[PDB]
Design a protein around this motif. Sequence first.
Motif: not given
Lengths: 123, 206, 1010
Positions: C843-860
Amino acid sequence: TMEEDEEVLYKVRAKLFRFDADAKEWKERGTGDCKFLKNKKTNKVRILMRRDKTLKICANHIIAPEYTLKPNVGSDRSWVYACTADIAEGEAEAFTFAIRFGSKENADKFKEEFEKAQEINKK
Amino acid sequence: VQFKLVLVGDGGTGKTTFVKRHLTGEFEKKYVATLGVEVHPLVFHTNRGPIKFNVWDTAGQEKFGGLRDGYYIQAQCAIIMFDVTSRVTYKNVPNWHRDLVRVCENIPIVLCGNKVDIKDRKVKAKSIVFHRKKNLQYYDISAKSNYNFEKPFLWLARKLIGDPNLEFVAMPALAPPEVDPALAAQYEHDLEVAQTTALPDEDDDL
Amino acid sequence: GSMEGILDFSNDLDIALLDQVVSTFYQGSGVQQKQAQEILTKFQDNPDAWQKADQILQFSTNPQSKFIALSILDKLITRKWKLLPNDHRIGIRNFVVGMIISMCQDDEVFKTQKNLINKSDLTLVQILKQEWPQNWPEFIPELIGSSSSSVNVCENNMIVLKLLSEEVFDFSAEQMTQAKALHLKNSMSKEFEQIFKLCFQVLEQGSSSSLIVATLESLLRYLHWIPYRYIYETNILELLSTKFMTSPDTRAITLKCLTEVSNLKIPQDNDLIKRQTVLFFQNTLQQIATSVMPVTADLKATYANANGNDQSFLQDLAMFLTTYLARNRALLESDESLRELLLNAHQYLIQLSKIEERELFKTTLDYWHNLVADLFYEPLKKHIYEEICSQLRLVIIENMVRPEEVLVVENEIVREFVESDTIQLYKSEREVLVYLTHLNVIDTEEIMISKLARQIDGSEWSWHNINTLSWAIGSISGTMSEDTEKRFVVTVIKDLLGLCEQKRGKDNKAVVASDIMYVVGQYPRFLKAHWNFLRTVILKLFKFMHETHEGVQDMACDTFIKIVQKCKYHFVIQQPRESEPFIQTIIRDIQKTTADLQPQQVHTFYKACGIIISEERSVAERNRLLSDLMQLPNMAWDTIVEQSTANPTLLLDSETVKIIANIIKTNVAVCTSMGADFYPQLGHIYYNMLQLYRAVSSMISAQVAAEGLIATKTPKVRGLRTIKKEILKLVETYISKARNLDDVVKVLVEPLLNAVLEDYMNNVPDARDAEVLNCMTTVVEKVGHMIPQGVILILQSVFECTLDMINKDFTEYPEHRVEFYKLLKVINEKSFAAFLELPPAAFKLFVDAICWAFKHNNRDVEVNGLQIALDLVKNIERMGNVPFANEFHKNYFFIFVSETFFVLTDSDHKSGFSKQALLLMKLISLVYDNKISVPLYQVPQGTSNQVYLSQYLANMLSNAFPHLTSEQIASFLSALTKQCKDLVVFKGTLRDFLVQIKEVGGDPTDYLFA
Ligand SMILES: Nc1nc2c(ncn2[C@@H]2O[C@H](COP(=O)(O)OP(=O)(O)NP(=O)(O)O)[C@@H](O)[C@H]2O)c(=O)[nH]1
Ligand SMILES: *[C@H](CC(=O)OC(C)C)n1cnc(-c2cc(OC)cc(C(F)(F)F)c2)n1
Ligand SMILES: [Mg+2]
């Protein structure tokens, strides 16, 4: 234009690559018509290829008999071969080229034509 | 017969990729941000002789902007680039235009919407109107597919030379030379590497 | 060489060396230019370089050197002005003011250094934005006074005022806080009475061209915001529409001024103001007719010649005429003395619409749409424009651009490639021509039939002429009566056939073929009512499918399916005079019809048959048609399955791989059009198809093991993966349209998961198909709620291993990236319990993955990441006061707050502002609604979470933005928390904060704007 003293033996649309040995990557050099041109006076056959809209030369060299077409690991419609004297960009450079076609049949016909031209040049 | 061309637009819109395509014919897939400016000469052959563009490819990222509007001094033409897959890059076009024309008050300017090859387009054709009141020429382009990739330079050459009938023409093709067994035993090192490095975009039409 | 010396500041600055570095950068080339550029950047970026600015501006021989020096001051003024001691601020001001006065009074510098004076004026404006009017109340009165001492100073003051208006009214929204913009706008408004007086006097008494042009350029900016009275209660409109239209030096800017004048909505009850609006239009059109071009002039020719500024003028004229008339043409429509003016202005527009210039045509076309739509509805208006509309019908018909459907192109009549610039234009042309046809259907038919009569004659035959006419004919489908359409359509086709017969050569042939195909495909209403002709058409399309010309072939297939989409019912019933439904005739000869087509065209053909078959609502008959249609691929499938079980080596043959891929592609094509009705065919192949999936999977793994990762590039492995990808696409396609979800769960899902999940998990990354994730997304979307354990299985097989593929950079495996977060989004939305079952480490990796998506400049990825975070918060909130929700907030509330703040403030994720703000508002509102029932801290006992949140954020911002004062941070947070129920105001406060962090000394009271 320097092309009226020549006859068109073969024409095919193609995408030409050059191998950057340092970066280990293939880099596109141009897309357009690749032509086999036979000089009316000397009977020598060259490859001449221009880009589609700018019409800029991206290949200009004799189809030397020393050359050999090799497959690329990733394609069944491409040929790789080394070139020692191409003057498309200016002073004769050596290049490792790859040229890809719309279909395997175009690559195979190109290879047949490429080899028939090497014979012509061996006179 | 050379002209200074400044290329501006948000970072990542494809300015450098567009210039590289015209320079060497390649398509660079990686994004390496431009630092300040990169100057490249670029020559086209026309029915009115050769025309040389000194292309000042400027940085779009603010933290890499370098001299910013200092690069525009004495520009004779310009291209403003945005990305049709990113609305913010079109929203910033008036800002790039503002800074440019404050330095270059009377030059021909092309507005280019790049990356029209991408299916999910976000800046719709009908919303692109900024060029009208500003007398900019506009083109949909794609450095990846080469769609209209020649049109910005063709239009600028017609304006700078002052001839609406100017066209690109085929350069003269000199006879190629007739041409090493010292290293022929080693041009299987360089060749086998090339054979076993797959070509890019094998799913393309060419 | 020795250019780096200027970077050493313990020195005294060698101005001569700087000028050589600058000259080397601007006038040099190659490596030395590149070296000077980097040196100049380092020089400009040095935080004390501004202290050299005065010395550069005094002693330098190079204008570019002074320009760069002013950029150094601009950077200081914009970002660190209020940190300077007051004596340095006064010094920089006096120094910039003094240099401007100096350059103005030297007449040769005024003429020769326009850029440098322009840059100085902008620099002065930056100081005004910081200092005026609070610390410079006399700037405007003194500017006005100094305008009489010199004509150079007066002209340059117009430039300063122009730039000031732009910075305050045109470009302040993103660059200043709301409070600061309001302050400067009010300041300019308060002083404009005096500014206009100086401006009107300059225009009235008129010095020479340059001072006038600069004054008009400043007026253009004022018109964006100044009260209407300044334009209508003075005599300025007569000056603009007469005096300044006569001289070409002032004509361009005056036309733009009048365009802006025209784009106000006047108090349209005042007869006096209406009269004035009419009057300046009358004046302007009179000046154009007498000084520029009469209304009969060939503007197409003038534009193409491109003499001097003709193209820009004609562009500006079109903008003026369309802007004014779209707003005010009603003022000219009733008074008979204004009829000539109304029609002359539209006649200019007709002439402008003949210009060969795509973007200008779209501008005029937008106006014509505005006009004809109004004539379509407004009573008693269309007769006024009858002659204009008649000419417009001709203009549009003659300039129709090629529609999507037409795949044949001249280079040499070839087969394209390609785009949407033309597609949107065609649609806009069709819209206007449809309106025009409704406005006078007789005139439209007469123009088109006369034009077609002259293609027969050869009077005007050409590829361009038959194309645009045929495209126009197709585009007006639906505007005529069925009876007129019948007569109209019959005539067109018979004649188009008269061109084919009388044309020879295949080039000519493929042109008229594409034109006939486009027209017939555009009139399904006609085809539905005339079966014998529809049958003849389809038969001919089938003939076209054997054509050596590649373009004709592709269009026949596209036209076939386009007609079938509309006329499907007439293929399924038994027609009079017929021995069977035509669908039976089509299916029987499908092998002969499609013999010469490429595979992807064959699949389109099968898809078209699936459309027809789905019109049969009798299940037994439909399933039998479906069985008949799939006879050829099912026979090949049985054969290839029988010789695949025994001898599993047979799939080594690349020709076998292509056959299999084409079989599956055919099933995909039919499933696309049949949807839920496809189930019986899917069941026929399903179990053997998944066995094939496993078999191909073993071959891929074997090749990679024996050849290395490079094997994934080879034609062989790429072909094997196409089989897996098309199998996944087939299952995804069906499930996305399935109506019997019980069968999906009990028959399809579990064999699917058994075949794809472990294979994905246990392949090396470069061999994993992103299409697995896409298929799973549809499975979860449609039946996820019915398979809680299957969703857990999906997560276990794809979550951690896909995350490890995409969490080292932002670029590798781009398709896996996109599908990964699509899958997490739907699981989080539809099967959140699957995340509750995750171990704490996962579940911690899940939170990590969500915040990782934040930092993408790819809009998808970015958009889905922000959406998952918002949905996750709502999922947790829905649980109420339970251990898992308590633990979630204790572990992750501040992680989400700080991560959202990071991408809000880092200037690299501007595209996500709106959704970032929504997420932050939700998080903050959770605390100030007391929806978190446990303490968020680990600070005294009893403290509310509201108090701790403010202290946490104040400390976070204090360390992340140390140049802010404590009061700035406190006022920002106080306003932000107050506003966490009002998203619009909340976002404005965030925007104000993003402005303030880019400078020093921002006013903390700015956050009271709301
Ligand atoms: N799909 C697609 N991608 C493109 C196209 N043109 C450029 N790109 C991609 O966009 C990314 C940005 O590359 P780049 O040319 O450096 O943009 P830039 O505006 O010069 N960056 P900067 O202003 O920060 O120096 C690259 O990954 C490039 O492959 C295009 O036409 N289509
Ligand atoms: C002209 C083009 C042509 O014949 O192309 C061939 C393949 C060289 N031409 C002649 N006849 C047609 C025609 C006739 C039809 O009869 C109803 C129907 C069509 C169709 F476009 F609707 F299919 C075409 N075209
Ligand atoms: Mg760049």
